[PDB]
Design a protein around this ligand. Structure first.
Ligand SMILES: [Mg+2]
Ligand SMILES: [Mg+2]
Ligand SMILES: [Mg+2]
Ligand SMILES: [Mg+2]
Lengths: 331, 331
């Protein structure tokens, strides 16, 4: 029974949920001949009440080179990047939920992702199978991809449809744990843009640039706009789309008017929908945010690592779209 | 570079679709440093019209030991079993869509599956992500699982739903090739039982016996029974359930009255619904049968193999249900 040394970067909601999940599920790890042992837990706020042993709290960066795995969920881009690089360079895998880091620091991280060292199922739709879903979709050639990827904006739009104001909805989303103190990334559609970029890279273009995604949020939406849409038998949702145009892949995030019965319009939780040849049309749904939900994704990748499987690999090569896609009508 | 030698067992609808899909996307495999070549295709009778070159057809078993991969979609149990064992024993991976073989010949196949030599995403819900979906769900502990796994009975109920009699619906399912001349396996819920058994082994009990799955088919269903259901706001579907009962796992297939709003009742294609802790509720749906759909799943596994990832592994150990469940009412 050798130890599975884990260096955890981030003691927030997600990090805490993950730490506790690993210890709670220790017997599942035993089936693999290992017992989990955390080298330390880096925390931004060492005084915030936590369910992590005091002796493991680290207010300052610590040596990660002796870890078997580095798990990161601290948000932000530059600091996490500088912290994980040394480990990745040492050949230590990185399990992360940081969609911002992967989307904006791909120039530095791609090389390691290319050699299967980065596991990031939790980076898109939390623990819901989004990346593994596309890995299986590789059996076909993508025709079009559309998803409602942000938990906060989805909740807000759902609540406004019920008559709740933008503000009441947002504050509740924060109380519920879906959104952070400053949900600006979420409501401006940037978080969805981060995730869409990750999906594009795994399926059609390993070097897809985050800067090419055109993104807009829900800031102009009101209960009035949503009720008028309902009157026409449509639902408004912030959709992240990947489709062909002029022979090149185009990615955009924007509110779209969807038929009320469309899978994306009637989904429970966030959702990813695709049309591919020859499979056809398929889609997956589940929670897109939350401490427990995200922890499930990180733990899923830890088990994937223990099984001997590589991390999530970028698409083998860039491939053009098989057909021009027709975007949904914008709001 | 190297060659990717493939021995194909089954030249039917799936076999033919897989053969042509590999040829259509062969150049793509160069990204993995390989060039695909089929060593031969085992078929019942090479005299029949087939979209595979006559010269590649083999009417009698042929040596498989030079193959890099054996792909099988013959249907049946004992014949396929005796043909693939020699390859597996020699360390050659098996990519199969044969849920019957895996469900009923597990005693012989499990050891190889444990070694990561068996890839069978296409054995459940065709190319739609089902096994990969559950692999990610491993991040949580299963509360309950319910799926509509058989394409034939889904089509049948969707039609009887519209007012078609059982015989009328079945005939069309057959006339369109969804159901065989003798649809027994499908309509008695055995195919669903096979697939449910596979899902159970991957997620909660590597030794789950097919013999313990309690299956009931469509025999007691009529268009009227469905009207009664429609009147009460429900839909009837043949559901494969895995839930806790008495602190042990119970697996059953049977027609169920689902609230019409439920993801399972709304699904146009086959579907898998799950509730787990701490993830919550997740759902995946897509085509569950068909040549192209199944080929997509087989090809997805070929890509998984080329990436250095092992096949689908059985649960690392058996573990009891965390909570007591109970399927919807039956008929
Ligand atoms: Mg995910
Ligand atoms: Mg690559
Ligand atoms: Mg070889
Ligand atoms: Mg499948």
């Amino acid at each position: 029974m050798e130890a599975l040394k884990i260096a955890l970067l981030g003691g927030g909601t997600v990090g805490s949920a993950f730490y506790n999940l690993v210890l709670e599920r220790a017997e599942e790890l035993s089936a693999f001949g290992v017992v989990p042992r955390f080298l330390g837990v880096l925390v931004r706020d060492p005084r915030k009440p936590r369910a992590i042993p005091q002796e493991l709290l680290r207010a300052e960066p610590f040596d990660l080179l002796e870890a078997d795995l580095v798990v990161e969920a601290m948000g932000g881009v530059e600091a996490p990047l500088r912290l994980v690089l040394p480990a990745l360079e040492a050949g230590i895998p990185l399990i992360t939920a940081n969609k911002a880091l992967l989307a904006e620091a791909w120039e530095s991280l791609r090389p390691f992702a290319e050699e299967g060292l980065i596991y990031h199922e939790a980076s898109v739709m939390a623990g819901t199978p989004a990346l593994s879903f596309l890995e299986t979709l590789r059996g076909s050639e993508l025709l079009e991809l559309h998803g409602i990827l942000n938990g906060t904006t989805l909740y807000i739009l759902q609540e406004m449809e019920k008559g709740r104001t933008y503000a009441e909805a947002l504050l509740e989303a924060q109380r519920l744990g879906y959104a952070e103190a400053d949900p600006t990334l979420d409501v401006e559609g940037i978080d969805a843009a981060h995730k869409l970029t990750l999906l594009a890279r795994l399926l059609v273009d390993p070097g897809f640039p985050f800067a090419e995604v055109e993104a807009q949020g829900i800031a102009r939406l009101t209960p009035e706009v949503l009720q008028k849409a309902e009157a026409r038998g449509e639902r408004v949702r912030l959709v992240a789309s990947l489709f062909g145009e002029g022979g090149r892949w185009r990615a955009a995030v924007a509110p779209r008017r969807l038929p009320q019965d469309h899978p994306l319009a009637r989904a429970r939780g966030n959702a990813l929908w695709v049309r591919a040849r020859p499979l056809g049309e398929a889609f997956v749904t589940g929670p897109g945010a939350g401490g427990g939900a995200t922890a499930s994704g990180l733990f899923a990748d830890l088990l994937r690592f223990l099984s001997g499987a590589p991390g999530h690999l970028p698409a083998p090569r860039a491939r053009p779209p098989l057909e021009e896609g027709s975007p949904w009508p914008g709001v």
